C-alpha cells in the first residue's frame, strides 16, 4: 500500500527534479505532494540536509551529486549474466526452452550464459558463430547501417548449413525485417532442424549490449506460434534491458 | 505528524544505499541490518526494492538497484556550472575584495563563462599558455597533448608572455607541484592571477577559477596564502559538481 510513506514522497520528488529541465522552487514541488504545505516543505528540507536535494541561492532543489555514488555503485556491481539467469527463474513460459545470451565481437557472438531445457548446438559458454548466421547475431547486426556491415563482412563467412544466409545481400533483407519487428528468427541457418528467435539486451546507453535467443525444434512450432514467441521475448528482454539501466 | 513518523526511514536508506554501494561483495538483508544495526529493517528493504532502489538476486543478496541512475543522470543533464560558481562565491563573503573567473578551455584558449567582483568579460578568449586558468587546466594534460597544441606558439601579449613550449613546460611543472598557477603579468602588465582546477564527477579538470590583483598588492606569501585558499574553493566546488 502506501508503506514506508517518507521513502515513497521523496522517491517521487527526486523523480521530478531528475526529469524537470528547469530548476524547480520549493512551492512548485509542493504542488505534486499530497501533504499540507508545512509538512511538503519540512521533507524537502530534510532531504536537502540529507544531501539527496542541492539548495541553489534563488530556493530551487536540484539533484545532490551523492547520488553519483549510488549510481556509480550499480555500474560497478552489473552482471549481466546473474541478472540473465535470476530474470529467467520467474518466467516460467520460457521454461519449455533453451536460451541463450551473447555479446557480439566483429562477426561473431560469443555465448556468455546459456539455461538449458528439454529441446533436443549445444551452445557452451565461450563459444563462438557467425553473427550473421544466429538469432543473436542478427538482432545485434541490426543495429548497424551499410557501412559498417560492409567492413565488418568484405568476406562473408561461408555456410553452416543449406540453410545459412549466402550473402551480403540476403543478410540485409532479413535484418530491415528485423528491425521492423524488434525479433530476430534463424530458422536453421546453424544445425538443420533448429530454429531460434532473438531479440536484443539494451544497456544504460541506450546501445544494444547483448542479444538473447530461444531455441526450440522447427518442425514443432507453427509460424504463428513462432511469431507469438518473438513478441513474448521481444518484451522479456526489453524488461530485461531496464535491470540493466536502459530507459525506454 | 504523518509523514514525520517515516522520516527516519530516509536517513536509514541513505546508510543502506552508502553500504550497498561501497561493500565490493553483495549483502543479504540479514547481513545489511545487523551491519547497520536496524530495527522495521524488513519493511524498508521491501519498499527499496520495490522502488528499485535495490536489486534483489536469486540468492537473497542485495545490489543497487537501476533507479538512482535516474537521479545521477538528472544530475549530470542539469548540471550548470556558471549557476554553482555564482552562488558558491556569493556565500564566500572572504573572497569580496577580489575579482574572480571562471573559464573552460576550448583547444588552446580559455574562454571567460563567469565573472565576479573590468578587465574580463563573458565570452572573452586567451591564450591558455598565458592565463592563470589556462596554465592550471594545461597542467593537468599530457606533455605528447602540449606539443599537439602549441606546435605554433601563440605571440606573446607582454614582454613576460612564456616564450616557448619549453619554458611552458617548466612552468607546468612547477604547477603541478604546488596544486596551483600563477600568472605573473603575461596577459597585462601589472596583473598577477592565481588559479586552480575545477573537476568533474570523473575526475578530469573541467573549469579553471583565478583571482586577479595588482602585483604589487602581492607580497610573495600572499600569494601562497591564496593559492591554498583557492585550492579549497575549487575543492568545495567540484564537490558541488560531481567531484
Redesign the interface.
Known amino acids: 500500500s502506501d ?9 517521487r520528488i ?2 521530478l ?5 528547469r ?1 524547480l522552487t520549493a512551492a512548485e514541488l509542493t504542488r505534486f505532494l499530497d ?1 499540507p504545505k508545512s ?1 511538503a516543505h ?2 524537502l528540507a ?2 536537502t540536509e ?1 544531501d ?1 536535494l ?1 539548495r ?2 534563488d530556493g530551487t532543489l ?4 551523492h ?9 560497478s ?1 552489473l552482471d549481466i549474466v ?1 541478472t540473465f ?2 530474470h529467467l ?1 520467474q518466467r516460467h513460459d520460457l521454461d519449455p526452452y533453451t536460451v541463450t545470451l551473447t555479446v557480439r565481437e566483429g562477426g561473431e557472438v560469443v555465448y556468455i550464459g546459456c539455461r538449458n531445457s528439454a529441446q533436443p548446438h549445444t551452445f557452451r559458454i565461450g563459444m563462438r558463430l557467425p553473427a550473421p548466421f544466429t538469432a543473436t547475431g542478427k538482432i545485434l547486426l541490426s543495429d548497424l547501417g551499410p557501412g559498417e556491415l560492409r567492413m565488418l563482412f568484405s568476406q562473408f563467412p561461408q555456410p553452416l548449413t543449406s540453410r545459412s544466409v549466402a550473402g551480403l545481400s540476403q543478410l540485409e533483407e532479413e535484418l530491415a525485417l528485423t528491425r521492423a519487428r524488434g525479433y530476430s528468427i534463424d530458422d536453421g541457418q546453424i544445425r538443420e532442424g533448429m530454429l531460434c528467435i532473438g531479440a536484443a539486451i539494451r544497456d ?1 546507453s541506450g546501445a544494444a549490449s547483448a542479444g538473447i535467443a530461444i531455441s526450440l525444434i522447427r518442425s514443432e512450432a507453427s509460424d504463428e506460434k513462432i511469431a507469438y514467441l518473438g513478441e513474448e521475448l521481444r518484451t522479456t528482454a526489453n524488461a530485461l534491458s ?4 536502459y ?1 525506454s
Request: no cysteine.
Open positions: 508503506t514506508v510513506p517518507a521513502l515513497r514522497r521523496a522517491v527526486l523523480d527534479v531528475a526529469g524537470s529541465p530548476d501533504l509538512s519540512g521533507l530534510v532531504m540529507l539527496l542541492a541553489s541561492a536540484r539533484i545532490g551529486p547520488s553519483l555514488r549510488w549510481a556509480n555503485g550499480f555500474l556491481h546473474s539467469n535470476d527463474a544504460y531496464e535491470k540493466l539501466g530507459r
